[PDB]
């Protein structure tokens, strides 16, 4: 009874899921690192294991990032890692020679003790590239000097191979704007032109004598957007670079490139998207020429579905598999696998649907061409989980679940990765149990062995109370939505508990999920006897498009009304205390958390909001415009979704606004603007701001934040 | 209902009504603002004219008014935007006193403009205005303007207006130009910030993409503004002559801490070395540029009040100035000096006209037609200020004027004499709710009263509003006041909470007869908290000896005193050691912080606004004055900081309030503090106001007071 979960535990190194950082190399050798922190080669044939790196990635300035060369003769360490946006990190690199020790500084020519925007490795051999001053550099091997592939790079204006903010956070959802041809002969990359894009300033108060902060291109709602070209260079000899032109329909009009991928060692598929995000064009490009052939096109009456989807091919290209929406009847559309048959030049490709039901095919993992099978992740088995399924491409059109019996009750939510010949696959658990990675043979899920058990962490949460989350199911409109109630160790049916209602932090995400998670609220629960509640309302993703697009043009309108009807039901329970009800949400969820805190009725005694996005006119183009469309251009519906005007009350409501000053996603401006109206409106509120922090606070401050929130919620909830 | 509540202080009943009195002739005084009306008064006939009416509303809430010399026009400032402290930037309009019609005041080619400065001249209707750091001149309402300087460059080269360092630290006002008595000539400062490092004031609250400014702000030991003093003639050619520095200062770092006209040609410019230990009074013939060394000063610590303005013979045979005199043990005090000017470089016999342990604060006037000179002095009492006259040529006698005005109701004064000195304005400011009055010189018949602050008087009358017991403490060889402001109903029995308020800038005086009403008065009345002020060493206006006890030990001394004062406070029966709180802002936030460390924890909670937390991060001319140069000559700078060795603030409940746009104490100070405070794991609470200054706007304001009030009241329970 004195073995329960305290905040500083979450920072204990016992917890903190240990990720195997598994990676394929041959169809034999998997490079998964990090059991004890050791990088390891494993031959799945012989079981033979080699120690590549040891507890060394300490010794060189706390190297936080590791990558093993293709030829397995070297390791690339990143140390001095500095955050930038989300996936963007800028650090210094070093090269450990796997066979003998000796480490090199990785520097651009003429430059010493340097800092790089990106490093990684290539595909063939020991080749690697690194980005510096927004220019791409290439080293054919450890031997040779580097080769600057682009001179066009200009700091904070023209980017090469790395994403500017808009492309990283919104469009691409990763900072890697370049891609390697399968044979390492060729490199495709994005040239992003921010010349005309308006810039926002991230201030720095904490530096030297006179601190100076940066200014980056950040197009706001309806603003000038980054123009962008897609080039391709050949890494052998001449380095002739060819721009791959857009589809003729998009030529001259505003557009984004939301994906590109290699199919052959020459052809690539670049998905183009209009600024409005209602029109998709899949193009296939011959890189030796620049021949660009319209292949498939899509449209929406609201906004286009997952834009990063990557199609699988015949490796010749006779056929290819992709996921698209199918009307499915009433109950809306669901993403299902498509059979498109590419031919004969000859536009037109026959489409055959390989899947259907009310559930989604999330990702298409692999196509095993030697047989009749294709592999994917699906909610079929259950909307709350994810499972690994195979269907037979050519054939009966049948379907079968693989992951279903792995843990039974202990793994309901998966992800997986197949070897390059698809002969076997890695199965990440992430399920209700403390996550476990495992390596199976394809044709025979004998489960073989287990790569990572997260052992220490398992026994850690075992000791602690750690209850089971009752799940109620609500009917809103025509839908059925999950309400997850996480309840204190000892639960009297009798008493009146305090209720924390946590918001989904970005739209189209899924709160209630079998995915294992441990975090602050778990502490709020156990100590402090608070029940935390999550409810996935309309707009929450991963069930149908119909729930997902219920948000279009009404933002904060719908999600809020649902969150409230969910509190309503919550309210009619005996064991929750209407007197003490609190809300929490961050980012966008801070936005909705705020909308909920206005005049409808006051169901909340106190609530706390972190990096709240408070006015959509002030948020990023590709985000606002997606849901609300263009601003003063076509719509004043933008005035409607704001926290800023009409603050008309937050009454006895106790409000806590937490914001990072250096935040690059939700600018501090959002809370500044809010706080301003909040004063002129005469509303009781309390704020905590972290000088020079981001949307995600550093390790230093973070604990302080949790402590803050924890104290806040626990204290206000007291009777 | 009959005690003082916060929102009263914002009630327009309160808010001292300032007459904004101003002389014109030796007859007509222009004091405005009784009902908000601008008024001419003929002190001969009593005749009053209404110049302006309840119109300075109608034109966009005009916040600022000035009447032309010839009394035919009024200059309104509206759209007033704060800049630093005295610096305001607004749009101007010209009301024609005789016939209403109003003009836009614009630089040529510019429409609906915004100006850095306007005011008026001396002779006639002439006026000048500053735009893009250039000086413009209008000989009259008729004529087009005349650009007197093209050298102006935004936030780099300033003309006639002070950059931050000169406004806040050196000059203590933003007016860098001065008019010759006859309006023939204009002297002004050219401030060159080219090489001075710049600090950024961020703006989060603006339009789509807010952009904040960046101004030259030399920090401790940094590059400083270079500056020249030119003079232009406002008639014809506009030949402009630079007035060269003293030869000794030539080529070395220096400030100009004052300039004033003496004749319609000669000026006295006081020069100061960067170190602030050497003064040179120079007198300059403007038609030539002849610059003659007159008097020089030195200190072993730092030079005394630098804005002192000397009075002359109007010929220049003699002149009066205030300087320190050794006075014996007990230190030095500023007393009036008789310097006799006669031919060439230096000499000039010095005769001291005053002495004792007390100071001559300001020398107001010299009546040349008789044997008298006029000044303000602490003679009558260190806590007050009185208006004294001494006989220059003669017995060397002294007599107090203000002594019997209010007896017990006015002990603290200031005054202004008419141009011929024939009669004077006496501002009360004393213990009673301030009252301005107009007296005849040779006969203080008190004549009449200009401003009674009537409504305000009856306002505080109704409310409880107690009397401040004053204890006197012995520290070292000195005797220092401790003012205890006590709740309406005071039991000798109970244990009260104690708020200890800090003096906000060094060399100021907390305990003073000067009337004041503010938040703490509310803290007192409602919430039964006793607020305490104690003027320790370094506090000004008694001797230099108390004042300079700070040199090179900053936060060292003031703190030890503030504590020994808490000690004594602690031994009282009726104060509760359990509940003790501290408050201080700006610099006082600095000391408030030093007190909150390790010595012992005598405080349960304390609150700090725009704390200056590291002197290396404060302004050059401030830090360097007390602590001298930085890594240049001293690491004693490491000593005075809050930043390292936050070693504890224990159960201490701390509230840090800071404006984001603050241009005096940068937000950096609290950012820096807050940083260490987290890595040190200390419990603290913060409230920051986006886009506010060192002085919060009206909007936020109230919210701040509420905060502080709640904080202090709640923690003390
Ligand atoms: C405010 O102060 C600044 C700094 O003192 C001042 O800028 C400088 O002004 C002087 C004016 O003469 C310049 O001095 C030189 O004049 C002759 C031209 O005949 C040249 O020989 C010089 O060549 C170089 O001198 C410097 C040597 O390092 C260089 O830094 C400089 O950029 C020249 O290349 C030079 O022209 C001087 O150039 C500037 N720059 C600086 C930083 O001193 C400015 O004029 C002042 N504003 C006013 C009106 O007071
Ligand atoms: C990214 O976009 C910027 C937008 O500013 C591009 O800058 C553009 O550069 C071109 C040529 O450098 C400019 O054209 C001009 O034409 C005249 C006539 O010959 C010539 O005198 C100028 O020197 C210049 O060449 C153009 O005005 C300018 N602006 C625009 C709107 O494009 C930049 O080229 C782009 N970068 C890349 C590599 O895509
Ligand atoms: C470096 O890795 C080795 C194993 O490769 C670790 O050595 C173990 O240390 C633990 C202490 O936690 C001992 O209980 C074991 O006996 C050691 N060996 C084995 C086989 O586990 C070592 O912990 C690693 N260094 C760290 C912690 O960074
Ligand atoms: C995709 O959405 C955009 C919204 O930006 C549509 O934009 C058109 O813009 C004009 C501008 O005046 C409007 O008059 C039209 O009504 C809009 N068309 C609509 C509503 O669709 C764009 O046409 C859309 N296209 C598709 C394929 O849906
Ligand atoms: C005024 O004080 C400053 C220092 O506060 C003196 O500056 C001198 O600076 C040099 C720099 O290396 C030192 O070596 C000297 O010790 C300083 N002189 C001293 C002791 O004062 C400056 O000389 C002082 N001048 C006067 C007139 O007192
Ligand atoms: C290698 O190790 C694993 C560990 O359980 C085992 O399952 C596997 O059978 C071994 N190798 C073989 C026989 O394939
Ligand atoms: C704000 O809070 C303070 C104290 O909690 C309270 O005195 C005041 O009534 C509140 N203001 C309003 C109008 O709610
Ligand atoms: C205008 O003055 C009159 C009397 O002179 C007064 O009653 C009135 O209050 C004044 N102005 C305003 C702001 O009402
Ligand atoms: C004007 O009135 C004042 C106020 O009572 C009085 O002192 C003065 O003698 C009067 N002067 C004349 C000349 O009317």
Numbering used by the authors:
A (entry chain B): 65 to 783
B (entry chain A): 66 to 782
Publication passage describing the model:
In this paper, we present the crystal structure of human DPP10, a naturally inactive member of the prolyl oligopeptidase family that belongs to the S9B serine protease subfamily. DPP10 and DPP6 both accelerate the activation and inactivation of Kv4.3 channel gating but with distinct biophysical properties.
The extracellular domain (residues 58–796) was expressed as a secreted protein from insect cells, purified and crystallized in space group P212121 with two molecules in the asymmetric unit. The overall structure of DPP10 is very similar to those of DPP6 and DPP4, with Cα-root-mean-square-deviations (r.m.s.d.) of 1.1 Å (for 646 superimposed atoms) and 1.5 Å (for 578 atoms), respectively. Each subunit consists of two domains: an open (no “Velcro” architecture present) β-propeller (residues 82–517, shown in yellow in Fig. 1) consisting of eight blades each built up by four antiparallel β-strands and a classical α/β-hydrolase fold (residues 517–679 and 707–796; shown in red). Additionally, a small-extended arm formed by three helices is inserted between two β-strands of the hydrolase domain (residues 679–707; shown in blue). Similarly to DPP6, DPP10 has three disulfide bonds in the β-propeller (Cys349-Cys356, Cys465-Cys468, Cys475-Cys493) and one in the α/β-hydrolase domain (Cys670-Cys780). DPP10 contains the glutamate residues (Glu-233 and Glu-234), but the serine is replaced by a glycine and the tryptophan residue preceding the serine is replaced by a lysine (changing the sequence to GKGYGG). In DPP10, the entrance is narrowed by the presence of Lys-77, Lys-126 and Glu-763 (channel colored in red). According to a PISA analysis the two DPP10 molecules in the asymmetric unit of the crystal form a symmetric dimer with a total buried surface area of 7300 Å2. The main dimerization interface, which has a two-fold symmetry, between the two chains (1580 Å2 per chain) is formed primarily by residues Pro-262 to Gly-277 and Tyr-282 to Gln-287 of the β-propeller domain, as well as by residues Phe-732 to Ala-745 and Thr-750 to Pro-755 located in the hydrolase domain.
